[PDB]
Amino acid sequence: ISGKTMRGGPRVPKAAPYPYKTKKYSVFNAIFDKTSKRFDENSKVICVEGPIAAGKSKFAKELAEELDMEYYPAVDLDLIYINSYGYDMRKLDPQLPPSCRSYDVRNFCLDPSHDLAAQFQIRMYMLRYSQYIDALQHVLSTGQGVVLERSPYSDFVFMEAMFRQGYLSRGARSVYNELRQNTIGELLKPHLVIYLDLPVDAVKKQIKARNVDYEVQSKVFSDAYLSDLEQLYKQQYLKDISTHAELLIYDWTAGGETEVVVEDIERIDFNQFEADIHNKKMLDWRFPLEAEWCEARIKYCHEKPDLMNYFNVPRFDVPELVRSADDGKVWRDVWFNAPGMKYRPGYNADMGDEGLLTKTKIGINQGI
Amino acid sequence: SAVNDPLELLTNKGTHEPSFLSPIWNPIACGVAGVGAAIFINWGFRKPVFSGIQKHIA
């Protein structure tokens, strides 16, 4: 909110950030370390969304730099198909059965009708969900606000747009809603959301500017498909989130300047809504007592594994998402014997890790 | 003797020699149990079972 010019200098944290990447924050940690002491005017969450290929990433980086905000790059399937040691899981796909073959954005743009599309869309929701929670931990433990490109709240638009084009089936949409309902309610909605309304014709021109191989060659980015996204952002997402978060709309800040945009944000006031307790605007982040602050911090810092275990919703009547038992055995063999997947990250000796005899530590909010 | 005196029956005499495994089975059984329990923990966390031998020794 207070840019570097307003403060005249870099952000001055109220107190030292808690090392949330390395130390857990359970109940007994909360007794000695309090949460509210670190919150500033800039302790907020910003979602910089827009249509496809609207230069959100460039705008976010510049924006997050002015407001001294942490910038979180948009999720991609490389986070699933590239392990920590850097090995590419996709190289293993010749071995795997066809149903378990790797699927990415490239594939979606090239064979959008494949049954793995329903899988692919749920993964994006799951990835955004985990990343979104990671931002909250950074906010609550460091007090520095975060800038996100696309929140999990906005992800159902792509699933809905894909459904209208007929790529998905009725079942896949039914499954997606149950996951979203089962999980979405546990997040804190963003303080501010910024939208970059590029008209439909413009984005179609803009996509060809990137000159990405598969996108230009693809057929998915049709007028109908791209039009569906526009109708979904404005009619369903933006109309809903504005009840909680401040909403700014620009034709394209990616093509425009950000210094004007930062000066637009700082004009927006975030305290007028604080007066009424039950006011919907920014309701989620209204904690009366210090206990409520710590509870939210504990939930995301210490109970994220619970948050990521709600995605277990059993639905087998849908045939697309089900993975056959015979494939699962084969897939388990190949997947978990790949270099670096034998053990948890940081223990695979064959990948060069050393000292395992005297090593006993595991990461926090780490897998396995 | 031809007599059945219950007090004689209970009273020890030192003739019996406890088996060899007797004074060591409970120590050795618990010792192996502790190590084996430590072996699960690594396995449960998908760690090399003999990694972090510190916990095994403890």
Ligand SMILES: Nc1nc2c(ncn2[C@H]2C[C@H](O)[C@@H](COP(=O)(O)OP(=O)(O)OP(=O)(O)O)O2)c(=O)[nH]1
């Ligand atoms: N099926 C599906 N595709 C998505 C989703 N989110 C992003 N994409 C796909 C659509 C496009 O093929 C492609 C567009 O990428 P982006 O719009 O995110 O651009 P990028 O973040 O790389 O940089 P930029 O937006 O230009 O700042 O990714 C989703 O939720 N579902």
